[PDB]
Nucleic acid binder design. Structure first.
Ligand SMILES: [Mg+2]
Ligand SMILES: [Mg+2]
Length: 1260
RNA sequence: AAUUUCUACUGUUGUAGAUGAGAAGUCAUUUAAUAAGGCCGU
DNA sequence: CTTATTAAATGACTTCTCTAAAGGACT
DNA sequence: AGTCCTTTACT
């Protein structure tokens, strides 16, 4: 039945399995007797510090390599001119002259870093363990003789002396870093990878500096006035200093002009993170301490000018920051608050503040509490001349009016009509002008609903009491302080103290808001002489003395926030090593002594055994011979990895090249690499074009050399005839496919048992809960995949292979063992629908039991579909099957809504809906859980938790362990209905959409290797014949619009559209003036009233209306109810009745059918057209929520679409109509796949007009 | 309320489904504080 | 609501490896 | 001349 019986074993992929190692017998006593666990704990803790130490030198190495770098200006100019040409031109002269302009600058930078002396040894044993003479140990000694303190920065390392001791630790362990070095090789690789400084510099930062140059020379034309240049040369003078101008090549250091920083040739001063910062600060500006105002930057000046002149085109020029330089550690040019290191720095800094604010005394020798009560009681008693005392015309004045009158613009517009009773905003506003303007404002306002000056004098009269709110709290605070006055405990961010953190923050909040209440009075000395004001000097004298002392809260608040929001340190798992720098690194028999790990099977149980470093001859052929018996089945593992490297390494080995004796012709082929089309020639030689005859000649040389090799003839290779090969990666493929064998040896239980006793071998049981004797019923997909690693039916035709480089980990207990539900005590079942309301267990149940002991773990890499390697043009094979089978395929489409995390409509080749249902509640889920609410409240809790400085819990596992459920319902749907899955790209234009994206990713990854736990191991769908229906994930950029049976369509006009007629609202009717209304409506064709039906009718054509992309003659009725959300909430509006209420206001007669078209556009009134363009917005508003979708346009029967009542083949509400119309764009996409012709390229871009034509005319 | 680990579970020393790991780097977002500004509050 | 700066946090994205045996250094 | 940790081979 299934159309995918053939999409199996399409390509190989990598996976890793995890198990628990249960130690066996005396291994655990023998381990700790050698204290191997505590020892590895410390060697992780050093390995971290070791790579930290190294990086400090890769840091020095990046910076000196890059101030040496220079890019030839006319090379940049070659990139720029070509880079913009890529925009608005698709030409392949361009693509070629761009990849050649990009590759030459990377070549220029890669040559530079490849020649330096530090580079050679950067990745070998001489970096830390120079055999005779070592690079890092010099650098640490240079930087100690220069007294430069590299490890002030990180707490875990004291001085440079300690950092020597830690590099010394890894004497014989240079290989242990090989993978780390891999991560560092990546930092410099010229290849097209984002981990590289060369990639960051050419792919990331150059474009961004070029976009800003285009935005700098295009800003000057449209808004010359935007940037106050003189002030940024006076504010940002530090980060305009550039020693070299690279357009002039002058070497003197002097402050640049912006015209110079945007010299394309000066991009060279922004290569390092120092100059990245400087460029970014010209963009962003900086704070300074002592300065109250913040020194602005280019991006702010663009912003402030565009809100001044009300031009929102200027936003197009917001400059882009440059990404930090890779591996760079960097502090900012803007001020950075001092940090707290422990609790004791939190109690001390609090005391000293709240003490001064109690101890401080004004000039007049009056406390902060007395100065304010005196000052404010005086205002409520109106003893103060109100012209003397002003408010700041600020967000602070706006906050006042909201707090006291419950609308912000109240004070604003009250003083704007009393002035008129051209004037600028005043910097400050007097209290008298406030009391008069609102005194006359309330004269016009209603007596019930009016805002009195006496409500303002309420707010402040009451300020003094905030200090008695604080005094009793600053006193139980004294209790809490004693608890944490401990010189480095740092045990206050431990979630147990969260009740005490709530107390400390309410102090800090009450004292913050009190500041934000006084703030409206303060007259900052921000140096403006443009205006001055004549205050009440006495009041301002002793106020502004108080205010400054309280202002010292905002640096206090940040420090405490910044220490209590810190996540507490957590003990994690660490690697285990059992004394081998190279442990489990390679399973092969010949490496068993170098890598210590061996596997065993006994009685369908799996074991891992790791010999003592001192006894690794334990399992040599001798010991396997005199200890053959029927106990344990040792796996013996034979691999030939990477044939393309390994057959040349071994045949042409200086050791053994003479024995294999290649002819001077085969050497010819090797040195010039004629056997390959893009392979490397031997050093000293030049690469020659690929010669097929040479290619089979070489392959034959390999073939003879494999039978001459003593060991590799044991594999039993059955190659194709070398005249079948067209390329040498095909021979390598056979060598690798058949270079992997698993045999066994039976070993006396008595032998294993006495060797495990003596600590000669550490034996574990590889375990998950399916290897429980009690486990009946489906194993995890992972248990399947591992058991097949050794199944006889896997081993005749290998589809599951066992990768080298497996790891073992220790995990210390993390929560106390608590017996959450005692044994034989019934426990109630959470499922209200279960038959058993409770259930009793003969045994104890312990919550999170896996975490109440220490455990050992085994991570194991495997390779799937081992033999059938790779798939190019995968989509092309999918598309091929789909064309031929396109009558049979169904479209599953999946949309997101506001109500729905995800929704699905299954539609057939016609357009009928087979299934439609939500995913807010799964299955078949015996415990209905509306996950839309579960996540909703888990997300609220987090925003709530961020604000009270409580711990921020993870949402991703909740979300993932949820989509895991729907991708299971999506696999079942696709295989059963022979479907393709169609999603929305991302009309329709961040947390509800990442649960939608997260679904797509777990579905692409699950369609990579789909196994039905139920299908027979031997046949398609099962362990050996697993469905592959998606091409492997690489980049979202490389992936594009299709990845297998998954497709993406443009998502426009899927929400708002009629399912039955295809109508869409593109009129976009808005009102601005009477003339455009009286001009829009006339553009109609007919506006009549239907008598026999009882609504209004607006017949028209779209083309006549202004926008040109508009095709179709439609008739749109006011039939039905409708919804609209107002602030008093939503109300039911009948527009058919709302129009009757408007015509009879303005005397138009409608009750006999006469077309009213002419009457409306003749009338002058603004109100008349305002409710009419409104009742038109409601006539066309198809989605109505508080939820359902309604349609004005009749079908042939003259009926109108309502989601409340629709057949099963049509949507049930606007959300399913969303996904239904994604599936209609899929039905379109199916089309172009069926009617695709051979040799051609599929087109997968739907334009809105080919869509409209297809949804509009399908029904009609 | 048990887990290689995650979710929901009682599915009975576990049930269903999911599960590519280690290292490395980078980016985006949220919330808070702050600076200057906009508008038919939030 | 914007444009910015600092801090603390969670999350998501692109790189590399998933080896046996040659080869050399200390012994 | 044996042990065993480090590079090696290519693309
Ligand atoms: Mg199970
Ligand atoms: Mg749980």
């Amino acid at each position: 039945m299934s159309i995918y019986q053939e999409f199996v074993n399409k390509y190989s992929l990598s996976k890793t399995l995890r198990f628990e190692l249960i130690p066996q017998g005396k291994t655990l006593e023998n381990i700790k007797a050698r204290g191997l666990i505590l020892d590895d704990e410390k060697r992780a803790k050093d390995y971290k510090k070791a790579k930290q130490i190294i990086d400090k030198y890769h840091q020095f190495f990046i910076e000196e390599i890059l101030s040496s770098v220079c890019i030839s200006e006319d090379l940049l100019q070659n990139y720029s001119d070509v880079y913009f040409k890529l925009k608005k031109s698709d030409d392949d002269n361009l693509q070629k002259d761009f990849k050649s302009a990009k590759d030459t600058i990377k070549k220029q930078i890669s040559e530079y870093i490849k020649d330096s002396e530090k580079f050679k040894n950067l990745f070998n044993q001489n970096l830390i363990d120079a055999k005779k003479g070592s690079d890092l140990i010099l650098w640490l000694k240079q930087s100690k003789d220069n007294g430069i303190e590299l490890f002030k920065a990180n707490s875990d390392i004291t001085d440079i002396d300690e950092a020597l001791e830690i590099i010394k630790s890894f004497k014989g362990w240079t290989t242990y870093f090989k993978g780390f070095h891999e991560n560092r090789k990546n930092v410099y690789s010229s290849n097209d990878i984002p981990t590289s400084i060369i990639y960051r510099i050419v792919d990331d930062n150059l474009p961004k500096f070029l976009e800003n140059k285009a935005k700098y020379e295009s800003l000057k034309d449209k808004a010359p006035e935007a940037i106050n240049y003189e002030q940024i040369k006076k504010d940002l003078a530090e980060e305009l200093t550039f020693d070299i101008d690279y357009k002039t090549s002058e070497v003197n250091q002097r402050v640049f002009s912006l015209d110079e920083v945007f010299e394309i040739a000066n991009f060279n001063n922004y290569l390092n993170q120092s100059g990245i910062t400087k460029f970014n600060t010209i963009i962003g500006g900086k704070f300074v301490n002592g300065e109250n105002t913040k020194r602005k930057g280019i991006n702010e000046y663009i912003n402030l000018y565009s809100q001044q002149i009300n031009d929102k085109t200027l936003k197009k020029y917001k400059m882009s920051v440059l990404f930090k330089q890779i591996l760079s550690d960097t502090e900012s040019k803007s001020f950075v608050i001092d940090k707290l290191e422990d609790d004791s720095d939190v109690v001390t800094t609090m005391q000293s503040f709240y003490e001064q604010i109690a101890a401080f005394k004004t000039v007049e020798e009056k406390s902060i509490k007395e100065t304010l009560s005196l000052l404010f009681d005086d205002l409520k008693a109106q003893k103060l001349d109100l012209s003397k005392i002003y408010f700041k015309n600020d967000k602070s004045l706006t906050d006042l009016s909201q707090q006291v009158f419950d609308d912000y613009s109240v004070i604003g517009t009250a003083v704007l009509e009393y002035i008129t009773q051209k004037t600028e905003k005043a910097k400050y506003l007097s209290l008298e002008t406030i009391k008069l303007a609102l005194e006359e404002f309330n004269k016009h306002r209603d007596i019930d609903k009016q805002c009195r000056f006496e409500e303002i004098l309420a707010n402040f009269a009451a300020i003094p009491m905030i200090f008695d709110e604080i005094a009793q709290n600053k006193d139980n605070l004294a209790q809490i302080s004693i608890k944490y006055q401990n010189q480095g405990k740092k045990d206050l961010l431990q979630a147990s103290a969260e009740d005490d953190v709530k107390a400390i923050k309410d102090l800090l909040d009450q004292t913050n808001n009190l500041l934000h209440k006084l703030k409206i009075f303060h007259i900052s000395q921000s140096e403006d002489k443009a205006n001055i004001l004549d205050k009440d000097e006495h009041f301002y004298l002793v106020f502004e003395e108080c205010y400054f002392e309280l202002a010292n809260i905002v640096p206090l608040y940040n420090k405490i926030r910044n220490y209590i929001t810190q996540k507490p340190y957590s003990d994690e798992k660490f690697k285990l090593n059992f004394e081998n720098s190279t442990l489990a690194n390679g399973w092969d028999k010949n490496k068993e002594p170098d890598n210590t790990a061996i596997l065993f099977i006994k009685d369908d149980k799996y074991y891992l055994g790791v010999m003592n470093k001192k006894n690794n001859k334990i399992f040599d052929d001798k010991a396997i011979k005199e200890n053959k018996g029927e106990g344990y089945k040792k796996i013996v593992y034979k691999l030939l990895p990477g044939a393309n490297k390994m057959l040349p390494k071994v045949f042409f080995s200086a050791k053994s090249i003479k024995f294999y004796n290649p002819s001077e012709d085969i050497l010819r082929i090797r040195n010039h690499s004629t056997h390959t089309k893009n392979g490397s020639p031997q050093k000293g030689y030049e690469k020659f074009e690929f010669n097929i005859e040479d290619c089979r000649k070489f392959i034959d040389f390999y073939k003879q050399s494999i039978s001459k090799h003593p060991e590799w003839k044991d594999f039993g290779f059955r190659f194709s005839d070398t005249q079948r090969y067209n390329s040498i990666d095909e021979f390598y493929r056979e060598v690798e496919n058949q270079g992997y064998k698993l045999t066994f040896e039976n070993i006396s239980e008595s032998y294993i048992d006495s060797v495990v006793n003596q600590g000669k071998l550490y034996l574990f049981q590889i375990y998950n809960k399916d290897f429980s004797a009690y486990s009946k019923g489906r194993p995890n997909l992972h248990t399947l995949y591992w058991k097949a690693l050794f199944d006889e039916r896997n081993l005749q035709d290998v589809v599951y292979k066992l990768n080298g480089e497996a790891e073992l980990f220790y995990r210390k207990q993390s929560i106390p063992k608590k017996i959450t539900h005692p044994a034989k005590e019934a426990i109630a079942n959470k499922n209200k629908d279960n038959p058993k309301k409770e259930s009793v267990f003969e045994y104890d149940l312990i919550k999170d039991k896996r975490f109440t002991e220490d455990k050992f773990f085994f991570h194991c890499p495997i390779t799937i579909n081992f033999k059938s390697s790779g798939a190019n043009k995968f989509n092309d094979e999918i598309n091929l099957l789909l064309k031929e089978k396109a009558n049979d395929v169904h479209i599953l489409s999946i949309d997101r809504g506001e109500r729905h995390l995800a929704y699905y409509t299954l539609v057939d080749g016609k357009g009928n809906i087979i299934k439609q249902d939500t995913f807010n509640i799964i299955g078949n889920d015996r415990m209905k859980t509306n996950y839309h609410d579960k996540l909703a409240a888990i997300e609220k809790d987090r925003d709530s938790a961020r604000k009270d400085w409580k711990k921020i819990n993870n949402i991703k596992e909740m979300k993932e362990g949820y989509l895991s459920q729907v991708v299971h319902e999506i696999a079942k749907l696709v295989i059963e209905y022979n479907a393709i899955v169609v999603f929305a790209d991302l009309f329709k234009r961040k947390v509800e959409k990442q649960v939608y994206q997260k679904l797509e990713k777990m579905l692409i990854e699950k369609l990579n290797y789909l196994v039905f736990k139920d299908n027979e191991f031997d046949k398609t769908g099962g362990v050996l014949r697993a469905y592959q229906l998606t091409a492997p994930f690489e980049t979202f950029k490389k992936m594009g619009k299709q990845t297998g049976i998954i497709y993406y369509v443009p998502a426009g006009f899927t929400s708002k559209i009629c399912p039955v007629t295809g109508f869409v609202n593109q009129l976009y009717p808005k009102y601005e003036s009477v003339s455009k209304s009286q001009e829009f409506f006339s553009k109609f064709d007919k506006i009549c009233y239907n008598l026999d039906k009882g609504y209004f009718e607006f017949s028209f054509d779209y083309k006549n209306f202004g926008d040109k992309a508009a095709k179709g003659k439609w008739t749109i009725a006011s039939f039905g109810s409708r919804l609209i959300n107002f602030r008093n909430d939503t109300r039911e509006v009948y527009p058919t009745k709302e129009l009757e209420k408007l015509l009879k206001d303005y005397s138009i007669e409608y009750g006999h059918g006469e077309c009213i078209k002419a009457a409306i556009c003749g009338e002058s009134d603004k109100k008349f057209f305002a409710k009419l363009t409104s009742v038109l917005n409601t006539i066309l508003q198809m989605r109505n929520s508080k939820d359902y979708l309604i349609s004005p346009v009749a079908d042939v029967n003259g009926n109108f679409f309502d989601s409340r009542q629709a057949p099963k083949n049509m949507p049930q509400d606007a959300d399913a109509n969303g996904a239904y119309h994604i599936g209609l764009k899929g039905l379109m996409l199916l089309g172009r796949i069926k009617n695709n012709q051979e040799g051609k390229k599929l087109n997968l871009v739907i334009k809105n007009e080919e869509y409209f034509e297809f949804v509009q005319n399908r029904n009609n």
